[PDB]
A paper describes a structure:
[name]-13, a member of subgroup 2, sharing 92.3% amino acid sequence similarity with [name]-2 and 82.5% with [name]-1, was first identified in the Gram-negative pathogen [name] from clinical samples in Italy and is a common cause of carbapenem resistance, often involved in large outbreaks. The overall protein architecture of the [name]-13 apo structure is consistent with that of the previously published metallo-β-lactamase fold, consisting of a global αβ/βα topology with a shallow active-site cleft at the border of the two β-sheets. The structural information and dynamics presented here reveal important information about the mechanism of antibiotic binding, as well as a significant role for the active-site-covering loop (L1), indicating that the plasticity of the active-site region is important for the broad substrate recognition spectrum of these enzymes.
The most solvent-exposed parts of the four antibiotics are very distinct, while in addition, imipenem has no pyrrolidine ring in the antibiotic tail. The terminal part of the imipenem tail was modeled in three different conformations (50%:25%:25% occupancy), highlighting the extreme flexibility of this moiety. The most solvent-exposed conformation, conformer B, lacks interactions with surrounding residues, most likely interacting with a water network, while conformer C interacts with the wider water network. In addition, Trp28 shows interactions with the pyrroline methyl group (C-21), present in all the antibiotics studied other than imipenem. The lack of this interaction in imipenem could lead to a reduction in binding interactions to the loop and may contribute to the observed reduction in affinity (increase in Km) for imipenem. In contrast, imipenem lacks this additional methyl group, which reduces the strength of the lipophilic interaction with the Trp28 side chain, thus resulting in greater loop flexibility. Furthermore, as shown by both shorter and longer overall simulation times for all the complexes, the tail of imipenem shows high flexibility and occupies multiple rotamer positions; thus, it does not contribute further to the loop stability. In contrast, imipenem shows weaker binding (Km, ca. 50 μM), consistent with the higher L1 flexibility. Notably, the kcat for imipenem is 2 orders of magnitude higher than that for meropenem and ertapenem.
Author numbering: 4 to 222
Write the structure that this text describes.
Amino acid sequence: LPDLKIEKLEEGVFVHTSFEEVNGWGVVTKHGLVVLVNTDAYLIDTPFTATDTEKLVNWFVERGYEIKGTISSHFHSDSTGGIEWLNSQSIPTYASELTNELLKKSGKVQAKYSFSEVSYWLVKNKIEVFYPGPGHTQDNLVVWLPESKILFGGCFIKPHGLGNLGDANLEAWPKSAKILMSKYGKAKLVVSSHSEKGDASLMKRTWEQALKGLKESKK
Ligand SMILES: C[C@@H](O)[C@@H](C(=O)O)[C@H]1CC(SCCNC=N)=C(C(=O)O)N1
Ligand SMILES: [Zn+2]
Ligand SMILES: [Zn+2]
């Protein structure tokens, strides 16, 4: 499978794309972000593997950046697979307390730092972490970049098919989608884990898909 790809979105915002075969889903394409604050870099989700996480870190280190911190949007491996490697390099990893306990219960390595707040400033006025409510998972988070007006929706944004429902809360997802739409209507760009980037309407598409999946789940 190809190496991690890095693509600039605009000044200070990069998309990282990694590929992994996962048991019954075939090769998964996963998008995360790298956000620059001056000469500091922040990883928004880890790629699937230690190897891709190392390639990503080394790419920004070679371009003169310090990796100040990572945030995992939820406990699944497409958001957290790099945490063990980052910890071994003493790069600060962050997850919600709920995410870290879901990781523990799954026998996975935890982020070194956790937080319980619904709205958490990873970097004050630069990187906000928000819990809209359950959807894709009980713990899923989004990341908001107030300066660029970019929203990273992770595996919660699902405009054309909900994907893995194993850990999903179909009852809550529509309500959580409305909360997200209410908070981030002013997003100029929505980046998701597995879909094409788009405008704020991807939040409304997610609301519609969640309702459609909830109606389906009731034979
Ligand atoms: C591999 C694991 O992280 C998994 C998950 O988080 O549930 C991946 C694989 C999947 S299915 C791949 C994409 N299919 C439809 N969007 C999803 C997802 O549904 O968000 N994420
Ligand atoms: Zn997931
Ligand atoms: Zn996913």
